[PDB]
Design a protein around this ligand. Structure first.
Ligand SMILES: *[C@H](O)[C@H](C[C@@H]1CCNC1=O)NC(=O)[C@@H]1C[C@@H](OC(C)(C)C)CN1C(=O)OCc1ccccc1
Ligand SMILES: *[C@H](O)[C@H](C[C@@H]1CCNC1=O)NC(=O)[C@@H]1C[C@@H](OC(C)(C)C)CN1C(=O)OCc1ccccc1
Lengths: 306, 306
């Protein structure tokens, strides 16, 4: 038993991380086969970063302008191109540690592990959720650009996120590995800001089931509610609408605990209207919304990866 | 910016993890050079596990009774011995992935990363603190024994914890890598229980500094307090006494924020006596005590590992 914010083992991604330097900008790259992927704003100077024509900026670059360091080994760049907001540096060496991988784009509400990196060296790993407003509440300092987010499915690394920038509220914005931003953000200097968020209702319900599995039952009740009546409360507390597909996804957890999904909705309704009255759930005094139903089943059952 | 519960990159430990089976018990082992380390209760049956003479149990074992699997490769055991509560299985092959390592025992209040494993396959990584009562609030299911906790210092893995068992409150108990239990727990069947815990005061102060660094200032004040007067409040709320060495350790964070340690103590005093009044700190409605001053400086500054 127990429930922790749990990241995937990071080894498979650690072996892909390299340092990319161009001009005076140093950031991280992801080295898979003979390509290094990194944010295209690496080609920018501090005055470039004010309304860039990236195509013009890139045609003025040379392969030798890109210093790529894999550990203490230099990688010769032999080609360069842009794909949307990422740069693809072709190197003369395929990464012998390339895991089986996929580039996947995730949905707001889904989680992934982030391997925070500086100077091509992994620093830490932690779990993030894609917020409904397409930001992530990460932990990133200067030099962290090019750090990736990912999930692992058996032996296959599904990369879903590349870090680009921090927004004024201290949250983070980036792209998928095709270079397409999550959300309405751009890699040019503007007053862009996160914009309004909501709470991920289905995840809170999953976490309430995690709590019950782990012995926290004080918020349970014999009350029930209808889906529509719950969704009226959800709206009032800035929670995402609950769909029948969410209810279906919560089936296995409902079955394991014997608490009907709509009963757990009634419990969430009371927690929203009443608060917790000085009590905690899984060591939290807040309703947690960054665990998916998958995450709860993963941890309250025990799957591994090879 | 941002602040997350952050584990160390797990790759160096992933390459050490193996599966140890003896009789009908399967658990994890740690393979370093030509030794596999694992909990000695692997030699126990469900009726052995009632008042064992482990020395008698072990003399009845043979090398071939121990099936050691490193991935899909079997490791021939060529010797076996006990060191306290761990077993040392000598194998005919040194682990080519052995990192530079040390066996260190940590202090209550210190943190470490746990690589949860099942069947020798890493499942997840997360950060834990050694509670003052020598338990850890982990996430462990059956088969997780032999999962290790560790810190990484530049390139060197300091192993500090091997998992053995879950206590009736759902918290976890284990040993250092010399096989010496953390706390008053034994690897035989008893009604042993955690016993009373306290809050790690110096860590809460570190986390309050993390909050200030990250822009959370609402709990600050111009009040100050004395060390003795703060420690009277600490006692009343079941917080650990704050020592002058704790104050000294908090110096760099105090200096970076410009908030005297004793001023932050005054703030903690008010938070203890008043609560938060519906506000949060670093996304928490509770005072968090599982980040050390080191952890805060690591994340609010950005160190890496090679
Ligand atoms: C790349 O390593 C870096 C990572 C951020 C620095 C602080 N936290 C981060 O996540 N990203 C940046 O520095 C990006 C590049 C610039 O963005 C464009 C103009 C769109 C190209 C500026 N920027 C950024 O994050 O600015 C906000 C910021 C906040 C805090 C500190 C520095 C910068
Ligand atoms: C080893 O993989 C296993 C891990 C625990 C199972 C559930 N959560 C865990 O952390 N450890 C055990 O099964 C240990 C071995 C036995 O302990 C001795 C008698 C001291 C040898 C029993 N045990 C244990 O953890 O019992 C409590 C328990 C709680 C919940 C589920 C199963 C067992």
């Amino acid at each position: 038993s127990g429930f922790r914010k749990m990241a995937f083992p990071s080894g498979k991604v650690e072996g892909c991380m390299v340092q990319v330097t161009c001009g005076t900008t140093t950031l991280n790259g992801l080295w898979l086969d003979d390509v290094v992927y990194c944010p295209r704003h690496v080609i920018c100077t501090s005055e470039d970063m004010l309304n860039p024509n990236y195509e013009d900026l890139l045609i003025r670059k040379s392969n030798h302008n890109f210093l790529v360091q894999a550990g203490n080994v230099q990688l010769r760049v032999i080609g360069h191109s842009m794909q949307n907001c990422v740069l693809k540096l072709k190197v003369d060496t395929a990464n012998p540690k390339t895991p089986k991988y996929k580039f996947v784009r995730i949905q707001p509400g889904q989680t992934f592990s982030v391997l925070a990196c500086y100077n091509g060296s992994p620093s830490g790993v932690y779990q993030c959720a894609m917020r409904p407003n397409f930001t992530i509440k990460g932990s990133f300092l200067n030099g962290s650009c090019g750090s990736v987010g990912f999930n692992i499915d058996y032996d296959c690394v599904s990369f879903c996120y590349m870090h680009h920038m921090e927004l004024p509220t201290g949250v983070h914005a980036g792209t998928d590995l095709e270079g397409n931003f999550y959300g309405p953000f751009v890699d040019r200097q503007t007053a862009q800001a996160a914009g309004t968020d909501t709470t991920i209702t289905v995840n809170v319900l999953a976490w309430l089931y995690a709590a019950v599995i782990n012995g926290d039952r004080w918020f349970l009740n014999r009350f029930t509610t209808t889906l529509n009546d719950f969704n009226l409360v959800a709206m009032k507390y800035n929670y995402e609408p609950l769909t029948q597909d969410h209810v279906d996804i919560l089936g296995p957890l409902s079955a394991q605990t014997g608490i009907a999904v709509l009963d757990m909705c009634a419990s969430l309704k009371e927690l929203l209207q009443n608060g917790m009255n000085g009590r905690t759930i899984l060591g939290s005094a807040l309703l947690e919304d960054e665990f998916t139903p998958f995450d709860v089943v993963r941890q309250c059952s025990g799957v591994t990866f090879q």
